[PDB]
Every structure is written in C-alpha cells, then in structure tokens.
C-alpha cells in the first residue's frame, strides 16, 4: 500500500523540534534527554530491549538498550476498499468547536465532483426471482 508513508515519516521527524526545543510539549520530559542523545551521537545504535539480546559483540562497538518508546499507534488501511466510522456516544472528555471566543461556527467548504465517486439511485427491489 506504498504511500505518503515516507513523507509522513519526514513530517513527523520535523514536528518534534517545535516540541523538543520549545517548552509546552508532550516531552514528558525525559524524551528530551533520550532524543537529544539519539540526535547527537551518530555512532551508537539504539536497540529496543528485545533486539539487544541478539546483537552480541561483532559489530559497531557503539550501541545501547534503548527503551521508553513514543506512544503513537497508527492504524493501517486494508486494500482499496474504503473505511467506515461508527461515531460514538460514550466518552469521558470533550473537544472544542470554534475558538473559545465565539458563537456559531460556519465551515464554508468545497464539494466533490460527479466524475469522482458517483451516485446510484437504483433501489434494489428484488432478491431471487420468486420475489417478482
């Protein structure tokens, strides 16, 4: 399903300096030290706690049992078939509609064409021939 995957990688690699250099971040906060190390060393290879058990001795004498992964679990789409969402009713928290200074919000928005995903008006009226 090759894709914006690499572009997404590069974007998220960029969207951390706005977090690891400035304050007010999800750095929580030690990821700073770990990420600064990883960015400043170039020599060590950082292996999660599993792989280190296998990388024994005969390579780069520069490594470390890294841990404390960043928590971002992203889903993967199936084949070209589309995706459906089942917007919920149960929750514990809320999200804001238009900025906390104003009433009614209006998202004047574009539209899709008809040469894209079409519109069928054919109403399926029959199963097997008996129903006729």
């Amino acid at each position: 399903h090759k894709d914006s995957s690499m572009t997404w990688l590069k974007s998220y690699a960029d969207m951390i300096y706005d977090s690891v250099k400035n304050s007010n971040s999800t750095i929580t906060p030690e990821i700073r030290k770990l990420y600064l190390r990883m960015y400043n060393q170039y020599m060590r290879i950082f292996l999660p706690i599993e792989q280190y058990m296998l990388y024994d001795n005969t390579c780069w004498p520069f490594s470390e049992k890294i841990t404390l992964k960043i928590n971002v679990r992203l889903i993967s789409s199936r084949e070209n078939q589309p995706v459906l969402w089942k917007t919920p009713i149960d929750t514990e928290n809320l999200i804001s509609i238009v900025q906390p200074d104003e009433p009614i919000n209006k998202l004047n928005f574009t539209a899709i064409p008809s040469t894209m995903i079409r519109l069928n008006d054919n109403i399926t009226m029959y199963r097997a021939v008996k129903d006729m």
Binding site: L36, R37, Q41
Partner: protein
C-alpha cells in the same frame, strides 16, 4: 619546582591549576566508552644512534607543534634492552666521559614510555571522541573514574591571556624525572589500587598531568572562544561542550593552528599516560 608557569609574571602551576573552572551542563551523554591497551606498534630496522636527549628538547620537539620534520623513528632506541641513560636523561648506547648511568628500574620505565611513543602513523590509535571522553572523565570525577553522566565546559579567567604562552611554557617544561616513579610502579606489576593511592599522595604529578590533558583538549577542540576584558589585561576564554561537538582536529587559524601528525602524537600521549589508572585489559 615543576615549572614557573610564565606570563611575564611567575607562577607555580598550582595557582594556574586552581585558576580555571570546569562546570557541567545538560544533555547527559549516556555513552560510557571503554579503555584499550595502547597499541604500542613499535618497529623499524633503521635507528638513530648517538646521544638522543630525552627530557626537554624531547618533549618540546614532540608536543609543542614545532617543525613537523617527519619526527620519525629517532626514538627507536627504545627497543634493544641493553641501551643506557645518562642522568641528564640522554639515551645512548655508549657513555663516553666516564659519565654514569641510572639504576635499572628507572631505565625500564623510561624505555617503556618512549617505546610506546615510537612510530605513530603506523600505530592504529582509536578515534578521538573516546579520548576526549576519557580526558574529561579524569579531570572531572578525579582518579575514581566514574562515567560522566553529563557534559562539561571549561573556562579560564585572568591570564594576561596568552594561551599560546601556555603552550610555550609547556615547550620549556621537563617531565621525565617527574613521571619516572609512576611508570616504575607500573613496571614491577603493582595494581590499580596502590597506584591510585600513589597518585593521590604524591600530587606533584597529579597537577602536571591535569595541566597536560587540559592543554591537549584545548589544543584539539573547536568549540573554543576567547575574549579580553578591555578594562585590564585579562583574557577570559572558554571552551564549550567539549565532548559532543568534536570529532576531528582543528584548523581555525585563530586559536592554535594545529597540524595533523603531531595531533596524533598528542592523542597517543593522553592515551598512554591515562592507561595505568584504569581497569583490566
């Protein structure tokens, strides 16, 4: 007694060692390196016989970045265990005017050391980030050799600033009948514990090699700046983040325009004189 550190004004190397500041910073570089047997790599079948000096023109020619005249095997008279040394520390194979040689242990130690220094560009010395790590390790934690867990900056204040003259009154400084008993201790198979006791006690060589590792890092770093407090003759000069932003020697011709093979000399130096402090092979 070691040398009056000159500035146009005398010194005793002790004021000039308590003159500085070594202050740490953020970004713990949890990157504890490991030592290494210092790769003596001695060999060649073409020596220079005669009276080769071994103290002052020796140390100057080798570590003062003076003429890079190929500075080769001339020390190769450090193999051949039957050579001798005359008290002025002239290494020879024929003591001419009835002059006397030193006792044995002294000879063994001195030959050991210069033997380690013989033939650089055939030595396979380790990359320099690690040697910077060990140097700052020593001069920060002391002779205990705990890993850094941080990073360090060095700053000097008030010198009639002449770091070139620092390197100079190095050029004029003797060391052999200062570090002889130390390598003597390492020759007859003592152990880390007692030699650490020794270096703690005597403290004449402690100050010396503190200064020496300091000078080599300030000569091989590149995060270096200087300034003169223009109200008096007093330079403050700093070197910032010594171990993270340095991977090769320097060429900024504003601080100390340092060549190459003498730089690998210097790293061999700090390697081979910090060797006996640390743990096993």
């Amino acid at each position: 007694m070691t040398l009056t550190y000159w500035d146009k004004e005398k010194r005793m190397t002790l004021k000039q060692m308590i003159q500085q500041v070594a202050i740490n910073e953020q970004e713990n570089e949890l990157t504890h390196y490991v030592f290494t047997t210092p790769l003596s790599m001695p060999t060649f079948g073409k020596p220079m016989l005669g009276y080769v000096p071994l103290n002052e023109v020796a140390t100057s020619k080798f570590f003062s970045n003076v003429n890079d005249f190929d500075r080769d095997n001339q020390l190769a008279m450090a193999h051949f265990p039957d050579t001798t040394i005359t008290q002025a520390y002239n290494l020879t194979n024929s003591i001419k005017p009835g002059d006397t040689s030193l006792p044995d242990a002294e000879v063994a130690a001195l030959k050991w050391f210069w033997k380690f220094f013989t033939s650089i560009n055939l030595v396979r010395q380790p990359p320099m980030d690690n040697v910077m790590y060990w140097a700052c390790q020593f001069l920060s934690s002391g002779t205990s050799f705990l890993p850094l867990e941080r990073d360090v900056e060095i700053v000097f204040s008030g010198f009639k600033g002449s770091h070139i003259c620092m390197f100079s009154n190095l050029r004029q400084m003797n060391l052999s009948p200062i570090l002889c008993p130390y390598y003597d201790l390492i020759t007859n198979f003592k152990t880390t514990t007692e030699i650490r006791a020794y270096v703690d006690a005597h403290e004449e060589l402690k100050s010396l090699l503190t200064y020496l590792c300091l000078c080599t890092i300030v000569g091989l770093c590149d995060t270096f700046t200087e300034t003169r407090n223009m109200d008096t003759g007093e330079y403050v000069w700093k070197v910032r983040d010594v171990v993270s932003r340095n991977h090769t020697p320097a060429q900024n011709v504003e601080k100390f325009c340092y060549t190459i093979q003498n730089a690998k000399y210097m790293i061999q130096l700090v390697h081979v004189l910090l060797f006996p402090l640390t743990d096993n092979k």
